[model samples]
Target: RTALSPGVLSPTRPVPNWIARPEYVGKPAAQEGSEPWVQTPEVIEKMRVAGRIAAGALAEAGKAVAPGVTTDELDRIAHEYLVDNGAYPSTLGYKGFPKSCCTSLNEVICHGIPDSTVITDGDIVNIDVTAYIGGVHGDTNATFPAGDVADEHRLLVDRTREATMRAINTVKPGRALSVIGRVIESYANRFGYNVVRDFTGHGIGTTFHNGLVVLHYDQPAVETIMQPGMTFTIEPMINLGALDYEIWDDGWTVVTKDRKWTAQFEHTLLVTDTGVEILTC
Candidate 1:
């Protein structure tokens, strides 16, 4: 008999206070004297290459997400494609993450580690792919239909992208840090949905984790202003019901406490002089 591998944490566990964990909170400030990959012209170019690699892998893996495909296959395809393209899967061993891409299905919110589970009809899964090359990183993700999903699932997919695009449109130099949150919340609330408070987009470029913090909610405390060349993500997780969420024992996956369907869209952005450049574009 064959042995079964462990599955991704399901039915997310709850956080103690519903407050963002200290490690989860992010900032753009590079560690002083740490000499990390500071964003230079060279750094951006490398990041661009990494972005292309990630985009290519996602394109191929995404097209393979039709019915009867196992989530494990998607992970394998992404890993192979990235390796073939001369890049490394950023999530493979980072603190023992163990997956090339994150595939969050149905009620699962984020960091749904890919497993051997088969993709079922009427299911919605979010695929997150981040690639690293030349000491720089690029990240992007989207939720796609697994099969002939329910009408509400399709709406969630369409609405999530609409809200994300609106937030991206607001990115530019001199824009207030609160514009992203306002735009996203405005659209999500209109659809009788809720903006996930547990997970917010963060800065990504020189580091896989936080370096430049970009909060996607309307908060008075985080006051980091946008400037030309500032790179961050505005991805928002919109829930079909309450925004409350819980993390699983795996310390990665997060899901809505109410078990409603969730959707997410993401792209890394670079603040241009007047507007923004989607690093993953």
Candidate 2:
């Protein structure tokens, strides 16, 4: 496989107004203020339904990935799935994001606009899905092998997954939030892989990217402690090379500066007294 570059971008996918949509957005770049740190009983129930559909949307989208498929097709499947289930694809038009879901392929880290980029044998792609129902939002993503992936690349995918799970397992009321990154960074280092710090898993609910910064690499400075009802994501982008990145001209598709393939896995969690609920599981 040769190095990859930006591909032809497709126009924004459409979503019906009937779908429960969020408020309009602007060019401030990131959303303002703090995240809705705690989950309410009302929000929790709506979140459960929204999460199930997002997962189902992602599941169906992944099944279509192959050597000949295009990332745009994956977005179409995810877009239709979200609307068909009575929820809005949250990423669409969120801060001007044109795609319904992020379809990141080899050398691309995250926020990949669904485009005409063709999948090829030995490539790995990451499908990040987010959906909204009422005022609640759910986010999740996974890395899939396009066809026959390289041995090391497959291991990178598997280990990156384990990193997310380990971080989630560390969640519980009273535990320090730093455990999220501590677990992930340590696990990735053991395999000679580097964790991409350019992006951190963030708080998601009611609004996309609510203020909580869930670091991928250890950041003890983030002094927030885990509390029951607090919702957030633990998405660690593990890379095959250095963690440095450069965004495409579109300002959405972030790629590794070295052009090496990277893999990422994410799941939104609601911290509970007993432990945590993998809301998007």
Candidate 3:
């Protein structure tokens, strides 16, 4: 375990009023039960627009990560990038998330709010970003090193990414949604890593999170089936130690109970006629 602790957070980065925000921006997130899991081609196209913006912002922010940079600065980069590209930073004000992006450090599984904590050269940080444009959302995240990382941690990052790509490759119409978790779990287990089960990939289209709950570990039967035009995220949180986690008092930061390093990779995907489309690529 490393000496990781929550740091002071900068105030929420403000969004320009001209840029359209999601419906849930100022309110508690609501899942409209009436919404369809399978999007029409029209909606899928809009999501692609958002997806491109998100991917670009993520790359720009990744380039800015290094020692002495605060997660808040990453948030600023992402926020300005998204708006400059005519999109809203989807995480901002969604369910009251103060930051435009989530920067999870070692041991932090997901939802680590951007703050004044200065990143050091030894750390591997995950920069998660989502952008809203054309009335839809595009979400993606990847783990990166601040500077020189140890060999073991580097392998953990690479393997976690492989686990996600393996799962994404299995998407196709008529395949059981259960196949995703089966793929990820098997790959992670081969290296003796544990997948965090608390959070799962979710449907993201008109809503930040739709009804689809994507598990990253094999279960008996997920019962859900993939179909063309269905879009969702496949994010795997793999830890080198115990899978147990605790939430910080902030109610958003989630860290491994053992404080062992964890890594995650995510991409919004679309089911195609024969395979999957990595929208966030």
Candidate 4:
């Protein structure tokens, strides 16, 4: 017997469908082969500035969270922030997303397009934002309470953020990129939560998600070695119930296996000569 939270529950809306096929972008096969090392100082500095813009957008969006605010409004705020800061909204029109930001709610897994959806108390919403500036890109995301969130929801939010940071702290020259996913799995396991399977982080710099998929679970995908100038994302999504989640018919919305609850956090990362840099600034 499950008891619902005392706060008001938001109405469910139709999910949007979206998919991304692997496409060859940026450096070509022959070009990348000749230049095995992709990280350059100029690219790193651009990413650092991109991180600052990404973080500022998130911080501004966080300040507007309230019971009556709509997800569309948040998207507008993010759009303005990117424009004011001299950056481009990475998610806009990428394969026809039609939104400046992604607002994934409750059961929605990711790539949730912002719309007229009104945020209600106790709802969990994840916003994914990317900025293009100075010929480089920085990506970041965070989930926050609509209003009056539950204790369990708070735990998920806090832990997911911690998982991202823990993975970030482990990054440095000579470490395997797969270790990021490993650490995320360990933390989620300790809390008896499941790490998201369908989506993972990736390399970001000159272009968005240029290389190296950063898996968040114990999988074979994250085996790349970490070296100076390597940049990527280590965002983790924690499911309140089962690890098994499904995408909605609309082709974009992802819901939990048990429809319990969900939360997520992400940030662009750069592996430095010694320590790691959180590019969300």
Candidate 5:
């Protein structure tokens, strides 16, 4: 009996039989230990291919977002697309996640479960997709207008994406990791919005969540310098009203405490000698 409650939850969509699953399937592991896991040129090449596939799947699924389209149907489109191309949906069965992708509607900030919820006109939605290929993972997402959304909500979506890109453009060799958050917070302030600080971006490579954590709000003292060959995601969740959030009983869906709409954008990137390369582009 809540926004988290669905009339009928959708079952997990199955990947095709021919597609090979990752070794971490069925059993999840952090794999974060005392070891230096840096991306080599060869590993970066594989990640680039996987990142492209993930980005393509996200775009394809977003095309079906309309007034009457169900999030479950959108999940099927992304799941089948990944399997058809010989890549596994990284989100499916990851730590007991039931679906192949995530769909966060208006008030939900992130990790909104894909289910029987029907999108309607004047609503905004975010579809998040991750693909695992060649033993690497690539993750990306974008908030889109379902139909004729309000001008205010549309601006939220646009500003969220803009903030993410601005933060990403700051990446380069020798830059402080903390600067990423500083830049994002500065941009959000100008727009009169608050940044969600609960969930920060993390490094992505051989493992879905890695050691190099990337924060998306201002924190000046914590210094972790960026270097060439490092890869991570820069996703900033901007809220229209408040930064506080409430997690549902399901323990995943997070919505704004004030029940206002939120938007987010993400991209997996690689640090180069002089600049950065957007892997999920």
Candidate 6:
């Protein structure tokens, strides 16, 4: 394995006591129930508000991306934004995750702990943020360019975002969750890219993660069907090289085995009676 130097790890961000939190907050591991939580019409509205807040926080953090900025600084920007808007960073402390947001640099697939690594020119980073508010959860992320990136890297980033948007477009009532994987894999393959299969999207509602699963690679055997009021994420991790990955010594960091760049995009969605709504768009 080609070991890259992971920068200084940062202290875990603290959540304010006034914000509403999930039951798993104080536990060493999250104790999420096995069943999916279908949002009621009233509950869905609360989720929508939370989703918008999360999206806004992501945007605020994205604006700070530049050469010389530390990933921990970016985390501070996002954490402050969410707290200012009355939301708690959901990823903090759940199952012992230490950061308020994830900062996955080039070659890292996901769950990268934010640190003092100074982002350099041509580097692409993915920032994953989730906010819990009004007893619901909102999640979204996008890979971003740090500075003057190469055309090849640009293409990979664009295609990864396209794969995510295209997969989301396939959502509808009665559609099988497997369709997400089918659409993502088909589109990514056409661009000479491979989809990472190790991590899949998941259901989100009152908890950060629930029972529903959304795969991003074709799996005909998956029979879970989408229904109105169901909410989940459709995140696809696309690699410029092979689909394999290796985790860093720090249990959370995951990087591509071939050391090639990877990109990812995510957004939470709510299945409606006739179509779908991007709660975290």
Best by lDDT: 3
All models, RMSD in angstroms: 8.1, 1.5, 1.2, 6.7, 1.9, 1.7
Clashing pairs in 1: 13-247, 27-213, 28-211, 28-212, 28-213
lDDT, candidates in the order shown: 0.74, 0.86, 0.90, 0.75, 0.85, 0.89
lDDT of 3 by residue, 57-122 (tens): 999999998998998899889888998999999888877888899999998999999888899988
**Lowest summed lDDT window (length 10), candidate 2:** 24-33
lDDT of 2 by residue, 1-281 (tens): 77766677777666777886677433545453476788788888788888888899999999999999999999999999999888888887777888889999988989888888899999999999998887788999999997788899999999999999989989999999998888899989999889888688888778777888889888888889998888888899999898888988898889888988899998889988789998885
Error of 1 at 201 (Å): 1.1
What are the models' TM-scores? Answer: 0.85, 0.96, 0.97, 0.85, 0.95, 0.96
The digit string of per-residue lDDT tens for model 5 on 1-281 reads 13444435676677777776765667655454333446888889999988999999999999999999988888888888888888999888776677888889988999988888888888888999999988888999999898898888999998888889989889999999898999888988898999988888988888888777788999887778998999899988899998888888777788888888999999999999898999998
| lDDT: worst 10-residue window of model 1 | 16-25
Instruction: Kindly list the per-residue Cα lDDT of model 1 for residues 166-208, writing each as its tens digit.
Output: 8899887778878888888888888798887757787767577
Stretches off by above 4 angstroms in model 4 are 1-37, 220-222
Off by over 4 Å in 3: 32-34
Candidate No. with top TM-score:
3
lDDT (C-alpha) at residue 150 in model 6: 90
Tell me model 4's lDDT, rounded to 2 decimals: 0.75
Candidate 6, residues 84-138: lDDT per residue as tens digits?
9999999887877888899999899999988988888889999999999998889
For model 5, the superposed segments whose C-alpha errors exceed 4 Å read: 1-5, 33-37
The candidate, 1 or 2, that scores higher on lDDT is: 2
